[PDB]
Design a protein around this ligand. Sequence first.
Ligand SMILES: O=C(O)c1cc2ccccc2cc1O
Ligand SMILES: O=C(O)c1cc2ccccc2cc1O
Lengths: 391, 391
Amino acid sequence: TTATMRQRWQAVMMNNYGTPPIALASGDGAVVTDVDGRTYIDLLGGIAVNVLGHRHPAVIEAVTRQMSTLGHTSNLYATEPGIALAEELVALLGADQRTRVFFCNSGAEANEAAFKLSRLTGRTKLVAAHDAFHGRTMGSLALTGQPAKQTPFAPLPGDVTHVGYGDVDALAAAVDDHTAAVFLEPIMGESGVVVPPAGYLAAARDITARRGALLVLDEVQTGMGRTGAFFAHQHDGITPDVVTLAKGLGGGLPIGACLAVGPAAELLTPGLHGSTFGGNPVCAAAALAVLRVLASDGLVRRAEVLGKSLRHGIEALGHPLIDHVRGRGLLLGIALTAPHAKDAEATARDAGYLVNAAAPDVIRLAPPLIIAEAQLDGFVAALPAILDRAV
Amino acid sequence: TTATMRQRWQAVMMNNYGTPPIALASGDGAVVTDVDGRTYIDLLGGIAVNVLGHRHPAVIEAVTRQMSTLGHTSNLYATEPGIALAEELVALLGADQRTRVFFCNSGAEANEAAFKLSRLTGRTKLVAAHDAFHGRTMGSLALTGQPAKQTPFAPLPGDVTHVGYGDVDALAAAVDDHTAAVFLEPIMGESGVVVPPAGYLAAARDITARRGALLVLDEVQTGMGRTGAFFAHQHDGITPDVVTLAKGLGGGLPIGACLAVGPAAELLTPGLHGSTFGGNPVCAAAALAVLRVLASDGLVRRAEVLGKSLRHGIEALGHPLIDHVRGRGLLLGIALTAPHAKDAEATARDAGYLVNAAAPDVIRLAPPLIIAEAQLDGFVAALPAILDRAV
Ligand SMILES: O=C(O)c1cc2ccccc2cc1O
Ligand SMILES: O=C(O)c1cc2ccccc2cc1O
């Protein structure tokens, strides 16, 4: 039962997450079932990870085949899946200069790799945005712009300056010839699906290039085609110096990547970085399968179409609790006129939908890219009652 | 072909590992096969990760079963495998106070969690050993005692003091009432399987206890039953405040853990730490299978028995290049009288064996716990010619 599972959790787990309110038993596609038999339509994807939902046959096949061929070896040895995955990610980025890949296990680790890259420029100053999220390890936590998550762990590694997200003048003023790198999410996810103004990413690219700073785009949450281009920054026609990926990269299997373009790709020399599990054949095979399905089923273009319709349906409700809808593709935020997002998360759960109160007044959606339009339509139809009950 | 695979590696991978000398295509048990069809007996286990070797049926079964049931959910939801794994790990530690578990993806992340735990004591000073290896992310790299690997990324998170490993009075002098934590490997793996003097870990436990500092034992490489006890520190009759695990924990699947005992288990409160993939059902299911097999097949005792026989066999060779063999169970270092370990790595490869030159004069072995006695016997018999060819 849910009570029994929660009691077991509380007896053994550290309390860094609190106690989960529901205990899940099974999942298939975009539908999960708790241990008491209740079903839920998953509009959150385990926080943007389950790009292909649960039990996707291509991921299952890839993992099973690879485990029956060759498992972990470490990077003392070259293995096919990681090399092929690196080739595919480089092709997807489409940079004009040579691009090189480092594999790791998580978004924090990918940003730690980028942090270490920035040190090799000879500069130690870094710029990120207030309310940005880049991970929880000591280096990535310094880049994260969330004082609540940071101050108990001070001092953090330096020297980071945080500026208002989307503020071109503030960014131009903070970046100078001592700035190693600027880290930006193309849409701030954890903060509440905060989309920057038109032209902001292009300004960031110009500012950084002019001052010799690396532009690092954290695509851990916005990548994997979620916004209707493989990398969200591709909507703005820029090429950053470094891109980080994780979350949906392995369709559920733990894997992250740091891609570096041009001179930044040559900064790491032998012995200067590594990760034991990085690039392992099983997780790389899963990620290769995810890329294959995204391509074969046209899921990147589909995410744009479904997200546009979803945004319009929510806006068409005219519900007084909804201030506006924001995001792109299948990363969407419902900004509320009053801080009832946590209550709306609960009432959505009662109605069988998994959503996220990303901020007191923002409901975040990040559904599997395989979600059916009917499931999105059903959520839109359920939303007025969900919101009425929240207040 | 090896040349084509290595050329593909060099075209796309960052150069932080150099270029691997061989490309592996398949593995089964303790035997791996390269792309040219050559077989090698794996005495390194992918750097102590493949505790059950490749294609172990219990791991394959657990992973395939869980993938066909429920994949990643995130820790917004309670799920069975992670809870059960935490329960099993707490039982194996056998501490007398309540122990709590945090899951992550890697050894670096496990030590980052411990690093952040130590911040919550109210102190910022940390002590580790010269030549210790604790990971490559910014926080874990500050603990790692390798200036050549740390200097390029300075400044690192503070305030860390390094002391000579095994030196009781040096540790006592460095630990004071401002020390948050001492980090120690029970045997220094990366440095060359450096075993501390008898009583040293117990002295570290006493020194930290008297000064109010946490004792953090990094069992990422020494754990998983490799030394003949589940945790290597259990040979010494102490209970640390924090234990970190990774590498072999998932039999190859990426997973790490931070266990904290007593008051240290309560430091992390809701929202203060997390990892998206941490505790996911698939990797936790693999780890549970590893624990089941270690117990059912008596592999922890087997590691002690085979380790003793292996050490005795190598020493019985009376080879002039071998100074001594050190370590415990199936973590062994062959310490040489001259710096030919790197050459011996290549000549061992020529003879069909994968070993590691951990230091210029130390060959490290960490074979799967399922390795055949005859596979070890063949290595010992081949070792004289391997060393003669190396010189
Ligand atoms: O994790 C590491 O730091 C690492 C470094 C290497 C350095 C040279 C070759 C292989 C390596 C494999 C690793 O996992
Ligand atoms: O990685 C995190 O920081 C994280 C924090 C949580 C905090 C509360 C509940 C669930 C959470 C899940 C996460 O992955």
